[PDB]
Amino acid sequence: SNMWVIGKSKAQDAKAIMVNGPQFGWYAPAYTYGIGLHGAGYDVTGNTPFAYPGLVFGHNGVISWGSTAGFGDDVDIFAERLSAEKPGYYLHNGKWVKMLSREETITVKNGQAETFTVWRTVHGNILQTDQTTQTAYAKSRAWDGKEVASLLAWTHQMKAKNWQQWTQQAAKQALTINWYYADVNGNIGYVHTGAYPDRQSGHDPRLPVPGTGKWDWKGLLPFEMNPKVYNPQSGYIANWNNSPQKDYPASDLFAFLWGGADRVTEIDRLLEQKPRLTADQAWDVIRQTSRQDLNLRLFLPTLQAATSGLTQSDPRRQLVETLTRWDGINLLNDDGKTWQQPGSAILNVWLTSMLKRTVVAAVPMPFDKWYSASGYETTQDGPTGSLNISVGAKILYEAVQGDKSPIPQAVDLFAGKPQQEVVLAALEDTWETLSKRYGNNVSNWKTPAMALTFRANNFFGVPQAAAEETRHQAEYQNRGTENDMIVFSPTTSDRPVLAWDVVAPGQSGFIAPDGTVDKHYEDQLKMYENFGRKSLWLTKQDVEAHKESQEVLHVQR
Amino acid sequence: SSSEIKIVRDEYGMPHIYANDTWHLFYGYGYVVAQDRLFQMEMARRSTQGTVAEVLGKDFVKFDKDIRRNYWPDAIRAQIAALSPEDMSILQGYADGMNAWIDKVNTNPETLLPKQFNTFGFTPKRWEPFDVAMIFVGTMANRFSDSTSEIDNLALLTALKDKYGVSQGMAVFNQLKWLVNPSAPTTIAVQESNYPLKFNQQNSQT
Numbered sequence: 134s135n136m137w138v139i140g141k142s143k144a145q146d147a148k149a150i151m152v153n154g155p156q157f158g159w160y161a162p163a164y165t166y167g168i169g170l171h172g173a174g175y176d177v178t179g180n181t182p183f184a185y186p187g188l189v190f191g192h193n194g195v196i197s198w199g200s201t202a203g204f205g206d207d208v209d210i211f212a213e214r215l216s217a218e219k220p221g222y223y224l225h226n227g228k229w230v231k232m233l234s235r236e237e238t239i240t241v242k243n244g245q246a247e248t249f250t251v252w253r254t255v256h257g258n259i260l261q262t263d264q265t266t267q268t269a270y271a272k273s274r275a276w277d278g279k280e281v282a283s284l285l286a287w288t289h290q291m292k293a294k295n296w297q298q299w300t301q302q303a304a305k306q307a308l309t310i311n312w313y314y315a316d317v318n319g320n321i322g323y324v325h326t327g328a329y330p331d332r333q334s335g336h337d338p339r340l341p342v343p344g345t346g347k348w349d350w351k352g353l354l355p356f357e358m359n360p361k362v363y364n365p366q367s368g369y370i371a372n373w374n375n376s377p378q379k380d381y382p383a384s385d386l387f388a389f390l391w392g393g394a395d396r397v398t399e400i401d402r403l404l405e406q407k408p409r410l411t412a413d414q415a416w417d418v419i420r421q422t423s424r425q426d427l428n429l430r431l432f433l434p435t436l437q438a439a440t441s442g443l444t445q446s447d448p449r450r451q452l453v454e455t456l457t458r459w460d461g462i463n464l465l466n467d468d469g470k471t472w473q474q475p476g477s478a479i480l481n482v483w484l485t486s487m488l489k490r491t492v493v494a495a496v497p498m499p500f501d502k503w504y505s506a507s508g509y510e511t512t513q514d515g516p517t518g519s520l521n522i523s524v525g526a527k528i529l530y531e532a533v534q535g536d537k538s539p540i541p542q543a544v545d546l547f548a549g550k551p552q553q554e555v556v557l558a559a560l561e562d563t564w565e566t567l568s569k570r571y572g573n574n575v576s577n578w579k580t581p582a583m584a585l586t587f588r589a590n591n592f593f594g595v596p597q598a599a600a601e602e603t604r605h606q607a608e609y610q611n612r613g614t615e616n617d618m619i620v621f622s623p624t625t626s627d628r629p630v631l632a633w634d635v636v637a638p639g640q641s642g643f644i645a646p647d648g649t650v651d652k653h654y655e656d657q658l659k660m661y662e663n664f665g666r667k668s669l670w671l672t673k674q675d676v677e678a679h680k681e682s683q684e685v686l687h688v689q690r
Numbered sequence: 691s692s693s694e695i696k697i698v699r700d701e702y703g704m705p706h707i708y709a710n711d712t713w714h715l716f717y718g719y720g721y722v723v724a725q726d727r728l729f730q731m732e733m734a735r736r737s738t739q740g741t742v743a744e745v746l747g748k749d750f751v752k753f754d755k756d757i758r759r760n761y762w763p764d765a766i767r768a769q770i771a772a773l774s775p776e777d778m779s780i781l782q783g784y785a786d787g788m789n790a791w792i793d794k795v796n797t798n799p800e801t802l803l804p805k806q807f808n809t810f811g812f813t814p815k816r817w818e819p820f821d822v823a824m825i826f827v828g829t830m831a832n833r834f835s836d837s838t839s840e841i842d843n844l845a846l847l848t849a850l851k852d853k854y855g856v857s858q859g860m861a862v863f864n865q866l867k868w869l870v871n872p873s874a875p876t877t878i879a880v881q882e883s884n885y886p887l888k889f890n891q892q893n894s895q896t
């Protein structure tokens with residue numbers, strides 16, 4: 134997910150502009166739900182995943198907000214000492230303590246029911262047990278016990294009218310989530326929220342700790358330690374699930390890293406390119422970053438240096454000159470299925486070959502398959518999420534930086550060979566693979582574009598619509614599942630705020646029993662594809678002015 | 691009027707809720723959700739509680755098991771039992787609103803029941819506050835704030851120690867999965883602040 138927030142010193146014709154593109158995958162009906170709430174201290178407008186009670190994206194006329202996932206490390210695993218002779222107990226601070234346990238029965242349509250037990254210790258539910266070592270692993274979340282309060286913090290923050298009131302609700306959201314602020318006076322801010330553990334000295338948060346007592350967390354770190362900034366000297370805040378701040382540690386996932394190669398730099402270059410931006414220019418950053426190859430920038434210098442002494446008829450060189458003439462923006466041909474330039478297919482083949490020669494080779498099987506993906510892997514339906522730089526690519530980037538990288542190269546990934554030789558050998562593999570399928574004339578190569586599918590199954594794999602309700606879009610766009618923009622104090626209108634969004638396929642998912650589809654079932658679908666947007670109304674006059682229908686209820690509790 | 695809830699929909703069908711207290715306000719929200727997204731909400735309810743197999747059968751029994759092993763329902767109910775009356779009203783108003791439309795649907799299904807309920811062979815059930823809370827837990831906390839691979843990290847580290855020996859296996863683990871990298875591009879610039887904690891990097895817990 135990405136977000137750029139532009140303050141007073143960088144905005145043109147307004148005092149603040151927030152644009153947010155939360156990436157959750159693409160679904161039918163729509164992952165988020167649009168809703169305006171007017172009453173009981175609330176006066177809000179926006180859209181929110183699964184219609185939560187609190188609006189994750191929206192504004193209240195004074196301040197606006199948005200989120201991206203934070204990816205801090207708020208989960209650790211405790212290795213609990215069991216005993217062969219007295220099951221159900223575990224050793225904690227010198228005594229043998231009984232586990233909590235509950236029985237569950239799974240009813241099954243046209244099958245037999247299944248019952249099983251769930252186990253829990255002071256550190257959390259048991260994920261898995263090793264009978265051979267008499268070890269049980271317990272997953273311990275810093276937020277455990279605060280799930281409801283975090284839902285309420287996201288509801289109450291919609292009533293805040295300034296930074297001080299808003300950060301009092303941010304201090305209660307315990308999940309690892311970046312939160313963002315903008316207001317009518319042009320202030321902007323950011324908070325990496327959540328509850329993080331106050332670990333004992335010597336605890337390395339990437340690996341399990343013994344649960345017998347000495348490694349137990351001390352508590353939770355204070356809200357003062359959460360990375361946060363208000364009105365930054367740059368004039369803007371940009372994030373694409375990159376690191377919040379210097380020296381902050383990331384989630385312990387082996388596939389997740391914050392390194393010198395990161396896709397947020399693509400948003401930074403566009404916002405640093407222009408001294409000020411208008412709302413239309415802030416919205417047009419969606420279209421550029423959606424179509425931008427993320428590995429060109431990273432490895433084009435290494436390619437250029439390697440092939441610099443080659444002759445013009447060497448095909449390894451031709452492949453790098455094609456890449457050098459390209460800006461890395463993918464565009465569909467008129468056929469609706471192949472891209473205009475072959476650059477991503479070249480980088481994909483080269484990078485697969487490079488990883489297989491370098492990182493993959495240094496790691497024992499079967500852990501080598503964790504570092505072989507190039508980042509371009511998809512199927513016919515297209516990517517299920519955002520594109521990113523693959524972990525293997527981030528590790529390869531540190532290795533091609535040489536002693537310019539701060540990470541110590543314990544193993545040499547190039548195994549004694551000069552970098553250039555490995556780069557040229559992978560480029561030989563790329564020419565062999567590509568020219569065989571397309572031929573030798575690079576200029577007529579018509580390589581396959583990625584497409585985008587609005588799936589009928591939700592993120593868990595479970596159907597939320599019939600299979601025929603799947604929607605397909607010809608161009609894959611690396612963008613938010615919804616996009617929403619809020620503009621504060623526009624010089625071009627008399628309204629204090631303007632806001633827009635797009636919720637595709639549409640607001641409603643309803644289909645009557647005779648098969649008649651709601652009128653608002655797919656009226657935002659073509660708007661999504663063309664980068665269009667619709668106005669979000671807040672004030673009573675605007676709402677009445679655009680009303681389509683009205684329903685009044687009389688109810689007593 | 692304190693009893694009145696006015697629901698206005700705009701030209702894209704987006705609903706705006708005008709009500710005088712908390713319970714009435716969330717009740718109208720719940721009600722338009724049930725009108726617009728009932729099958730989707732019901733399937734999300736079964737997905738976040740592991741009750742998919744009851745309506746879709748044997749292919750979802752492992753899914754349902756995995757969902758129920760990942761939370762402790764009595765802990766969420768204890769949290770809802772401690773709310774104040776104003777906080778509780780958000781959750782109960784939302785479920786009561788949903789329920790008002792579900793009762794009308796279940797009373798006039800020939801015109802009101804979403805087609806997919808007939809396709810998949812089942813009908814909607816009434817909601818309680820616990821079900822609303824569990825939609826957020828299941829799709830927000832469990833999707834985006836529950837990530838760990840610590841156990842797999844250890845298996846990797848063990849394999850690197852076998853291959854390169856004990857101190858060297860550790861240093862290669864730090865090259866593939868560093869703890870921090872000082873050149874990562876950051877949302878907050880270094881002139882503004884840096885994180886103060888320094889962590890152990892040698893698996894010192896062993």
Ligand SMILES: O=C(O)Cc1cccs1
Nearest residue numbers: 134155156200201202834
């Ligand atoms: O960035 C993400 O992965 C998904 C999310 C967006 C907003 C909150 S969680």
Ligand SMILES: [Ca+2]
Nearest residue numbers: 208209338385
């Ligand atoms: Ca951890």
